[PDB]
Every structure is written in C-alpha cells, then in structure tokens.
Tab-separated table of C-alpha atoms and ligand atoms in Angstrom:
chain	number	residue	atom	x	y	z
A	1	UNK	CA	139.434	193.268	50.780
A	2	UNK	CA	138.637	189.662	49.861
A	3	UNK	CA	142.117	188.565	48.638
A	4	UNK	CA	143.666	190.438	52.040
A	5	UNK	CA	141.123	188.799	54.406
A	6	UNK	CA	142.094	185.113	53.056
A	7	UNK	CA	146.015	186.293	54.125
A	8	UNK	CA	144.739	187.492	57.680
A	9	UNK	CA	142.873	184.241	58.257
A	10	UNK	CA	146.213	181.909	56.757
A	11	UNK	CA	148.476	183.691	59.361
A	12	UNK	CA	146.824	182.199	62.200
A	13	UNK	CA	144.766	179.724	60.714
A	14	UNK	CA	144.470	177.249	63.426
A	15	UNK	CA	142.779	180.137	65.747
A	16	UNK	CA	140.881	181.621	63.544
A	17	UNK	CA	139.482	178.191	62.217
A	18	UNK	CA	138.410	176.987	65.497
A	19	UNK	CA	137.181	180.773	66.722
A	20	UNK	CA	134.585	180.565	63.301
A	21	UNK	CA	134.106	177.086	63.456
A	22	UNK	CA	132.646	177.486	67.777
A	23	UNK	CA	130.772	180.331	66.641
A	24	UNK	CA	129.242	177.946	63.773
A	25	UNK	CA	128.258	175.035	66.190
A	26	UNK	CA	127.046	177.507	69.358
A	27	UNK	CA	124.724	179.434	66.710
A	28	UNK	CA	123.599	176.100	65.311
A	29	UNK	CA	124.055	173.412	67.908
A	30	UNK	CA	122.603	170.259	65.417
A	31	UNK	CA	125.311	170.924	63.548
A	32	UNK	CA	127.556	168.863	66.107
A	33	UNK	CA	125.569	165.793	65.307
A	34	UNK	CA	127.461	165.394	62.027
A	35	UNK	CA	131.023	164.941	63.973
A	36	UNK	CA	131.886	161.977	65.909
A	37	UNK	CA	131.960	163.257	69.818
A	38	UNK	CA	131.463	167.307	69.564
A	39	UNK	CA	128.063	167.186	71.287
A	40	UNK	CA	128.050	167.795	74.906
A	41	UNK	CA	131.554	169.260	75.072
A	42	UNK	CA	132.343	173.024	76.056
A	43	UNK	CA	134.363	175.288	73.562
A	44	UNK	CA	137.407	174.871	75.524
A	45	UNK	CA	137.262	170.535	76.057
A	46	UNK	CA	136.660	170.753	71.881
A	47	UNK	CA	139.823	172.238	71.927
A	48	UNK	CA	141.632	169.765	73.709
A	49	UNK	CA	140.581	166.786	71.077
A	50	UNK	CA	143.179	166.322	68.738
A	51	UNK	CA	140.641	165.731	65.605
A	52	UNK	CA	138.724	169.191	66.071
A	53	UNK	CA	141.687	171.149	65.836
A	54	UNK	CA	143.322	168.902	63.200
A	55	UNK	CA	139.650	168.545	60.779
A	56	UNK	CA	138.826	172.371	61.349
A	57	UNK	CA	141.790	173.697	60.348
A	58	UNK	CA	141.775	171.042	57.222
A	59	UNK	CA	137.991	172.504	56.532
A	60	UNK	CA	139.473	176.323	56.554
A	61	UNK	CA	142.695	175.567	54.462
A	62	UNK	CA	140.356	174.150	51.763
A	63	UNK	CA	138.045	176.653	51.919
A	64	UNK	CA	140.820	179.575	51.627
A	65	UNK	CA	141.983	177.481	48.792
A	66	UNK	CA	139.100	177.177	46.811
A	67	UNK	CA	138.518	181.411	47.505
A	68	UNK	CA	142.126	182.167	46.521
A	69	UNK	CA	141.145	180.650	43.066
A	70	UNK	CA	138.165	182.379	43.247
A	71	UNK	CA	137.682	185.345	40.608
A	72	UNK	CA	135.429	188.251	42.349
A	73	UNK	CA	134.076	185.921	45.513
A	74	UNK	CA	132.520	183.398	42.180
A	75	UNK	CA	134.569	179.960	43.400
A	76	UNK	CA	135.912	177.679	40.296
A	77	UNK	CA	132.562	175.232	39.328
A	78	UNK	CA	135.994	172.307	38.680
A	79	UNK	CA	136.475	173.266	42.802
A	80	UNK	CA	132.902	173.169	43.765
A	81	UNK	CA	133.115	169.778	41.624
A	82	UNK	CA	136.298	168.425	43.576
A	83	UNK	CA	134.477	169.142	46.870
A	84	UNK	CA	131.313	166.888	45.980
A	85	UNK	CA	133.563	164.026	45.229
A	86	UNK	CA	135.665	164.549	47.764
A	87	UNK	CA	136.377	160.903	49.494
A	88	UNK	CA	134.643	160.429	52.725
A	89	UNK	CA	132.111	163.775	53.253
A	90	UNK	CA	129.375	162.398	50.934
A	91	UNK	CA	126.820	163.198	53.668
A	92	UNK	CA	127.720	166.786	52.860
A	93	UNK	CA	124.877	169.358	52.250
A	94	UNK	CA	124.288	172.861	51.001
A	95	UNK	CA	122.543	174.161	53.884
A	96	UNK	CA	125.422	173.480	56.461
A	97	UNK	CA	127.385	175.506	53.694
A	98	UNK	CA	124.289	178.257	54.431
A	99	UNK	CA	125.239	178.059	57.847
A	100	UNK	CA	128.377	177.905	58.260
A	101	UNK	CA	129.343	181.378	56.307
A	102	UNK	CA	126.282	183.391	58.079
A	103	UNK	CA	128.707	182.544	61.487
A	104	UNK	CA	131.254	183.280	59.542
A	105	UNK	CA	130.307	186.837	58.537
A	106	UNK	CA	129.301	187.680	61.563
A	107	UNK	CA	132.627	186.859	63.376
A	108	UNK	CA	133.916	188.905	60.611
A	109	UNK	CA	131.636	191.993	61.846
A	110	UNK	CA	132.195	191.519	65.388
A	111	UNK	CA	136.252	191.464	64.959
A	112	UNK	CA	137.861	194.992	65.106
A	113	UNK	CA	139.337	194.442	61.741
A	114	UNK	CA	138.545	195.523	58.620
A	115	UNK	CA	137.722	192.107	56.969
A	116	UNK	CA	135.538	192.441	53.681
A	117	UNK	CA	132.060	190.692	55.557
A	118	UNK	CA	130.255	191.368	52.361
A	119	UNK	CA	132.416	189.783	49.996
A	120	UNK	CA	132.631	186.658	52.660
A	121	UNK	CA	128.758	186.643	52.588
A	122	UNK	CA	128.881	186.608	48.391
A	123	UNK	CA	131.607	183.956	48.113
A	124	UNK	CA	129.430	182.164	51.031
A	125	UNK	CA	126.052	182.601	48.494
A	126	UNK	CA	128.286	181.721	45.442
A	127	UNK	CA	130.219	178.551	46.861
A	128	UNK	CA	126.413	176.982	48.007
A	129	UNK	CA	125.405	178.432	44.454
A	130	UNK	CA	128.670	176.029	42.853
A	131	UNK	CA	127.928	172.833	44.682
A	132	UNK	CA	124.142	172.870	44.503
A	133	UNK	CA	124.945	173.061	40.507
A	134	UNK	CA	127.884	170.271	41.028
A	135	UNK	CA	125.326	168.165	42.899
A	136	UNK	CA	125.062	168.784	46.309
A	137	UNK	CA	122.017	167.396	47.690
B	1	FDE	C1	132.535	170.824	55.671
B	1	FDE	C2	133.691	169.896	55.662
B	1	FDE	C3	134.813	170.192	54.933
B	1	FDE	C4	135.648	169.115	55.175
B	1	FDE	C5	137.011	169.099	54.625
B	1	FDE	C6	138.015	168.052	54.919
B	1	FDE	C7	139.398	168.043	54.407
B	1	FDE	C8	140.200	168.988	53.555
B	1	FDE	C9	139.997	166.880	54.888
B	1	FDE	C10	138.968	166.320	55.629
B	1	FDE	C11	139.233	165.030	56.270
B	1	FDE	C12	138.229	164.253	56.982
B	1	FDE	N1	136.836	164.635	57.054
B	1	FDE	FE1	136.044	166.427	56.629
B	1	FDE	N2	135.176	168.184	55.988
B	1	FDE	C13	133.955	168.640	56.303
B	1	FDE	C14	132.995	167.955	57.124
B	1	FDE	C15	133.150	166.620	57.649
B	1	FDE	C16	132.045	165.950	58.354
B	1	FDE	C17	130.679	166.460	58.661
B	1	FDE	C18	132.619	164.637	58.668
B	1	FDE	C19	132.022	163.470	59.411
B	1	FDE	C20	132.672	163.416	60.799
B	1	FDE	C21	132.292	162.133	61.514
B	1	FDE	O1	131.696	162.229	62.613
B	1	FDE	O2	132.580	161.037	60.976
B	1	FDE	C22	133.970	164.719	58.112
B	1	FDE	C23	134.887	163.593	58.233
B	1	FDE	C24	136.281	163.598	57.874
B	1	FDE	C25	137.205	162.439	58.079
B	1	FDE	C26	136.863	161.132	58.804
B	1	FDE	C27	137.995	160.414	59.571
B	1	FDE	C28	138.715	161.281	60.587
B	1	FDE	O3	139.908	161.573	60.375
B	1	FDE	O4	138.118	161.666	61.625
B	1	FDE	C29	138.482	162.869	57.470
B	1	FDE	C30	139.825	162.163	57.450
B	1	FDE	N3	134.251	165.880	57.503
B	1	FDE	N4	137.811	166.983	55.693
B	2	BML	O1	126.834	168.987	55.885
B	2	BML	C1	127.804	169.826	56.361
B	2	BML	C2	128.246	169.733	57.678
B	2	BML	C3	129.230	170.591	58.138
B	2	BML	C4	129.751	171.544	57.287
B	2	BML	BR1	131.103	172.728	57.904
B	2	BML	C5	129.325	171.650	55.984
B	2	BML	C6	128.346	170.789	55.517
C-alpha cells in the first residue's frame, strides 16, 4: 500500500520525480510559469538542465518525507507548518498542490504496478487540507 509505494518511488527517485513531475506540467502547462526557464522546452531538453532534475527530485524527497510521517495518508499539521515557512517558496499555493497529486494519481494508474492511487489521492486531499489550515493562501 501507501507505506510500500513511498519505498518504490525512493528507489529510483530521480526518475520517478521527473516522470510525475512532466506529467504535472504537460497536463497543466501554466504551471511552468512558476520556474525560471521550463516554458518552451520539450520533456527531454528539461531533462538536460541541471536545476529541474536537481529541484524535482528535492520537491519528491520532501514530499515522501512528510508522507512517511504521515499516519493513514493524514500528513503531520507541524509538516504542513514547516512547508509554509519554508525559506524561498512563499509564492506557494494550494491549488498547484490540487494539481500536482491529480497527475500524480494518474501516473500511478497508468503504471503496471500496484501502487495504492487511492491512498495517493487522500494524502494529496489531506496535505492541501494541512497547509490551507497552516496558511496557505
Ligand atoms: C512545490 C515545491 C516544493 C519545493 C521544495 C523544495 C525543496 C525541498 C528545496 C527547494 C529548493 C529551492 N526551491 Fe523549491 N519547491 C517547490 C516549488 C518551487 C517554485 C515554484 C520555485 C520558484 C522557481 C523560480 O523560478 O524561481 C522554487 C524555487 C526554489 C529555489 C530557488 C533557487 C534555485 O536553486 O533555483 C531553491 C533553492 N521552488 N525546493
Ligand atoms: O504554487 C505551486 C507551484 C508548484 C508546485 Br509543485 C506546488 C505549488
């Protein structure tokens, strides 16, 4: 389930962090206008700039911290907290959250494996949930 899925993803991290992350932008292309240079670039000349690779993988190691703390897909409200504050990232909203697990899940759904989509899809809910409470515009 959940706690297997977040094992599968850490074992190749980088891939599966960029893989989620170019289904993310190429089902929601405005969402490359909040990174420095992604918009007009092909999946493949995204991979070949060393801050993509470097910042997506950074995004999908803190996220598979914050759900290996998590207690049945419900993240920690002191992790949603840490997020807001985070340095840098203050433009940061909820809805790019929203978006960002729907690709998600359905990577998950596509893949042949048996990842836990619907448990992916409540932490998704349930992380937005945390930082709208911790002040998230
Ligand atoms: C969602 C999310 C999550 C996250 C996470 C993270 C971690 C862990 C770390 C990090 C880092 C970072 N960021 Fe991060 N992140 C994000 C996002 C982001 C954005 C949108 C931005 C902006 C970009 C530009 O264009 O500027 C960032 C941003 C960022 C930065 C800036 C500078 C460079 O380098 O490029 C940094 C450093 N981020 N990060
Ligand atoms: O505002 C946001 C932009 C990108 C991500 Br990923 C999450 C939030």
């Amino acid at each position: 389930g959940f706690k297997q899925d977040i094992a599968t993803l850490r074992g190749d991290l980088r891939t599966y962090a960029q893989d989620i992350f170019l289904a993310f932008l190429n089902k929601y292309p405005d969402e490359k206008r909040n990174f420095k240079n992604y918009v007009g670039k092909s999946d493949q000349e995204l991979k070949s700039m060393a801050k993509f690779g470097d910042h997506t993988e950074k995004v999908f190691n803190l996220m598979m911290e914050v759900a290996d703390r998590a207690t049945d897909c419900v993240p920690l409200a002191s992790d949603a907290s840490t997020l807001v504050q985070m340095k840098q990232h203050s433009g940061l909203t909820t809805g790019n959250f929203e978006k960002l697990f729907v690709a998600l899940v359905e990577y998950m759904r596509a893949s042949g494996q048996s990842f836990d989509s619907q448990s992916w899809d409540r932490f998704g809910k349930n992380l937005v949930s945390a930082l709208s409470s911790a002040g998230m515009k």
